[PDB]
Amino acid sequence: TGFHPGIAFTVVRQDRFATEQLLYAERASESYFVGQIQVHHHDAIGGV
Amino acid sequence: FFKQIRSDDNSLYSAQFDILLGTYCNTLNFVRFLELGLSVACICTKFP
């Protein structure tokens, strides 16, 4: 009806934006160990 | 277009075809009326 029942609210909403980051990394900031390739086969739809 | 070959690639090894194994026509026997024996009853004369 357009009546103010003597009480107010605080609206809280959250949005989501698409950005583009800018990454920077120092040399030799990562020790990285590589194992060995292993292969496995298992049937599927009309194909091995 | 069709991408749905997700390296499943079946029906890519179809080799069915259709062949024409030859044909056969014939000739017409050009009969000479005079070399019959019926012609012994008529006398043939040309008149241009």
UniProtKB/TrEMBL annotation, chain B:
Which protein is depicted?
A: Major capsid protein
Gene that encodes it:
ORF40
